[PDB]
Symmetry: C2
Subunit: 162 residues, 2 copies
């Protein structure tokens, strides 16, 4: 029985992670996508598609609100699109870089218990706790979820077979 039950035990653990990974959140303003396209840029959330499940929470918190940044080649030519822009979030972030070879912003940071503390300026801190559902690593989360699902099923059948 110890074998059969170890399988069921492993199947429950897998389900638990699946449940964890499938919670809603790590959402983005619906308008950011079109905006990125209309600016000729790529969302930072899409660039950090593959951030590991291990790093996603820390990095999403680290970036602060700039996590929703649209990355484009040159800011100078974005101006064109900003002048008169109103149909966008009250705070829109634009970062200059290469979507294909992007360099992480550098932050003055200290870590805490599943949280981060960024020094924005002198006598100005930003406390960003780790999100349950990080904005980054969405692609990696999805693959993981599907893989875990496939394993869950193999174990469910093995278990039923006794």
């Amino acid at each position: 029985h110890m074998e059969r039950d170890e399988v069921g035990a492993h199947k429950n653990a897998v389900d638990e992670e699946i449940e964890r990974l499938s919670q809603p959140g790590g959402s983005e303003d619906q308008r950011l996508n079109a905006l990125a396209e209309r600016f000729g840029g790529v969302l930072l959330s899409e660039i950090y598609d593959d951030v590991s499940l291990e790093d996603a929470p820390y990095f999403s918190a680290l970036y602060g609100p700039s996590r929703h940044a649209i990355v484009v080649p040159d800011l100078s030519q974005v101006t064109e699109h900003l002048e008169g822009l109103t149909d966008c979030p009250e705070d829109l972030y634009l970062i200059e870089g290469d979507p294909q070879s992007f360099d992480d912003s550098v932050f003055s940071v200290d870590e805490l218990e599943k949280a981060v503390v960024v020094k924005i300026a002198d006598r100005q801190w930003r406390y960003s706790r780790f999100p349950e559902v990080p904005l980054f690593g969405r692609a990696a989360r999805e693959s993981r979820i599907e893989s875990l699902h496939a394993e869950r099923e193999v174990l469910s059948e093995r278990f039923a077979t006794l």
Copy 2:
């Protein structure tokens, strides 16, 4: 008839501003209030209670996300309150200063068509359009509304007497 009608016209004008000023928004995370109290600080929101109707839009946008900041006496002394803090927004801002004689943050900014563009860092821009309902100036906005309402009523009564 020209007198009576100018009264009506001025009345409608007042009504229209009341309408504008009364739209909901300039909202703030409901949890921020208790935390400000728990950290022994005061929300920037409250400190900038009386920002003129003229300056509120521009000023609210300028601050970016830091607009929801909790101002406290000494940052290093809040640390203890942040350790393990999870029931708060994913990004919590804390500014060290004196609520009664608070000094503004210094921003590197350029203005646009009712919007601001703050340089967060090299190759990093924040575009913040003016809010219809700014976070700051709530108190001044409230007084304006009441006064305008009181004026509205006098004009309605004058009108009815023709």
